[PDB]
Design a protein around this ligand. Sequence first.
Ligand SMILES: O=c1ccn([C@H]2C[C@H](O)[C@@H](COP(=O)(O)NP(=O)(O)O)O2)c(=O)[nH]1
Ligand SMILES: O=c1ccn([C@H]2C[C@H](O)[C@@H](COP(=O)(O)NP(=O)(O)O)O2)c(=O)[nH]1
Ligand SMILES: [Ca+2]
Ligand SMILES: [Ca+2]
Ligand SMILES: [Ca+2]
Ligand SMILES: [Ca+2]
Ligand code: NA
Ligand code: NA
Lengths: 217, 218
Amino acid sequence: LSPLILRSLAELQDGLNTVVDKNWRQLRRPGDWSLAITMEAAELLDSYPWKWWKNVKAQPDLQNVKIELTDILHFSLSGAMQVDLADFMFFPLSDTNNALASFQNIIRLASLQRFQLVTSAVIAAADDIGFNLVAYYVAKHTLNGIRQMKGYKDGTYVKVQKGVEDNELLHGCISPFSLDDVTNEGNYKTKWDDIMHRVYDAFGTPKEERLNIGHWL
Amino acid sequence: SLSPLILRSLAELQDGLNTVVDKNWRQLRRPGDWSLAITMEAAELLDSYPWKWWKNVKAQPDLQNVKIELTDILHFSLSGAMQVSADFMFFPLSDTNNALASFQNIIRLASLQRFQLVTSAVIAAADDIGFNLVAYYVAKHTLNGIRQMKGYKDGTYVKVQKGVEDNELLHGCISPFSLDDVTNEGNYKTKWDDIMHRVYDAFGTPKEERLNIGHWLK
Ligand SMILES: O=c1ccn([C@H]2C[C@H](O)[C@@H](COP(=O)(O)NP(=O)(O)O)O2)c(=O)[nH]1
Ligand SMILES: O=c1ccn([C@H]2C[C@H](O)[C@@H](COP(=O)(O)NP(=O)(O)O)O2)c(=O)[nH]1
Ligand SMILES: [Ca+2]
Ligand SMILES: [Ca+2]
Ligand SMILES: [Ca+2]
Ligand SMILES: [Ca+2]
Ligand code: NA
Ligand code: NA
């Protein structure tokens, strides 16, 4: 990913973290981000049929893998703001052995606070798998804000409260967007705005509580 | 500090259970499999604390669940140590920040394949927290057997019943047993057998499908 796009992602990330807490930088510490990456990596690992004692014919939940890698990126962008890849990542990740090893290595890197390296690993993973990480990031960033608006912090929102996990709606919201659309330096901000409005529409956010791309960048 | 006789019998139960899962599990499994399993249980354990600063921030620790997850880690650290054949823990674990640091260190230890040291950590945690780890082990061991015979591998097992997960039924099963009851070197087997039968009663296992302590030890 280009330096411009990475910067814009990090700026979105700062903004989201601020919605969660003003003064997040004084409230948080690098070990919080390591723990967060660890827990998402566990969710990612749990998308594979790694259990030899349970549901042994299960297939990998490749749709969920996309969400979990996107969540890791939120937290590694965060950790980096408060602070070789071939030694850790093994391709192709469609091979379950490669995934389990590569994604357990994300936990070791998170524990060492190697956040920029985690970010590169996520980007490398999305490129190998062949999904649009940028588009997923913007979609899930928008959902993270909607969660905070609906009282996630206070316990008045839970992610499966309309009977379907909120994350699952994100695939449809990003379906029209190519890699080039969301990374083209002269037009990306409009595509990021389109993604935001598709997610707001998916969750019926009132027009008045919506934020445009210009609010974040 | 558990006695060598109790430690060995826990390990024999565990080998027993691993063999129900697969004959020749030692040839099928690798040390890294046990490392992964422990990592995943420790994530369950960390998630029993209110660590998330963005979600339901006034929540309290699920300290009953903590007991189950430590017990799960023990199954896997006993297994790891068999497969391979301080500065890590911060007490008290009643403090969230202590638990979060300690249990992330368990993940690192699991990754380093220091399985006997994970086992010691779990034993020390249970002493610190003050619950009967040996009784919980025998109880979950029984439920683990029940799962295997009620379709866990094939995907037909039903884990949650009207809101309540199988694991939650174990607490009532272990209530009547002290530490001395389940560790007395002359008598413990009979008490382990009583725990097994309470778990079977809780899950309504038909008598013909029950085992006794003697099907596992001797
Ligand atoms: O300070 C924070 C806290 C949370 N998140 C976001 C990142 C991630 O996308 C989401 C994870 O939320 P969750 O409550 O663990 N639920 P799920 O993993 O299903 O999205 O939280 C942030 O971006 N910054
Ligand atoms: O070869 C194995 C595989 C699994 N387990 C047991 C240990 C642990 O107690 C349980 C974990 O089962 P799970 O399917 O992860 N579910 P839960 O964590 O809710 O018990 O599986 C073993 O003892 N040996
Ligand atoms: Ca999560
Ligand atoms: Ca997630
Ligand atoms: Ca588990
Ligand atoms: Ca567990
Ligand atoms: Na998840
Ligand atoms: Na659990």
